[PDB]
């Protein structure tokens, strides 16, 4: 027995590797789960979260605000092309729409 | 006792924007997003393993599931992040 070191710090991540492993084991996905799968999955989830949060914080600063709100989340997602492709059929509550008026209707 | 990703999302937020908060509604939306992505990837990996008559879900299945589900440059930088974490975790055993 030695000092207990978490697998998250072992892999250099912030997301919970052990919790991810338990969910994979209990989710009726396959008979057995390999050792590197939770690490890979946690890394991917953390990367996507970081991307979205950086864009949303940029929008919040552009609005001269300190706290991120669903409007900022929606603006970032709909303004990023790859994120818009990924979250194509998702509705964000209290998000609103992008400002856009067709050219023909303008005076 | 209900478990969520709130503390980890907050840690990533502090890493990215050191002076910036988040409201509880936005945190709930981020929770929904993480759960949704987890489900998509796990389902794709399970389908792959069943297709190839395997009984184990390894890091190879996760890597192929990410390539099928993420578009364009998002997949390239995600695959690089996942590979780096596995090789760093193996070095320390």
């Amino acid at each position: 027995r030695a000092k207990a070191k978490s697998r998250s710090s072992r892999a250099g991540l912030q997301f919970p590797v052990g919790r991810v492993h338990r969910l994979l084991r209990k989710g009726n996905y396959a008979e057995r789960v390999g050792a590197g799968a939770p690490v890979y999955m946690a890394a991917v989830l953390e990367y996507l979260t970081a991307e979205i949060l950086e864009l949303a914080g940029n929008a919040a600063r552009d609005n001269k605000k300190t706290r991120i709100i669903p409007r900022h989340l929606q603006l970032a997602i709909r303004n990023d092309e790859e994120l818009n492709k990924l979250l194509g059929k998702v509705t964000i509550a209290q998000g609103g729409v992008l400002p856009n008026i067709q050219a023909v209707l303008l005076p | 006792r209900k478990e969520s990703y709130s503390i980890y999302v907050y840690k990533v937020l502090k890493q990215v924007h050191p002076d910036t908060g988040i409201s509880s509604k936005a945190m709930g939306i981020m929770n929904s997003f993480v759960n949704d992505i987890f489900e998509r990837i796990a389902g794709e990996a399970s389908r792959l393993a069943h297709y190839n008559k395997r009984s184990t879900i390894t890091s190879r299945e996760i890597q192929t599931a990410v390539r099928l589900l993420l578009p364009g440059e998002l997949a390239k930088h995600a695959v690089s992040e996942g590979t780096k974490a596995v090789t760093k975790y193996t070095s320390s055993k």
Binding site: E54 | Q15, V16, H77
Partner: peptide, 7 residues
């Protein structure tokens, strides 16, 4: 701070 090479 943490930044992205994709942006």
């Amino acid at each position: 701070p943490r930044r992205s090479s994709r942006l």
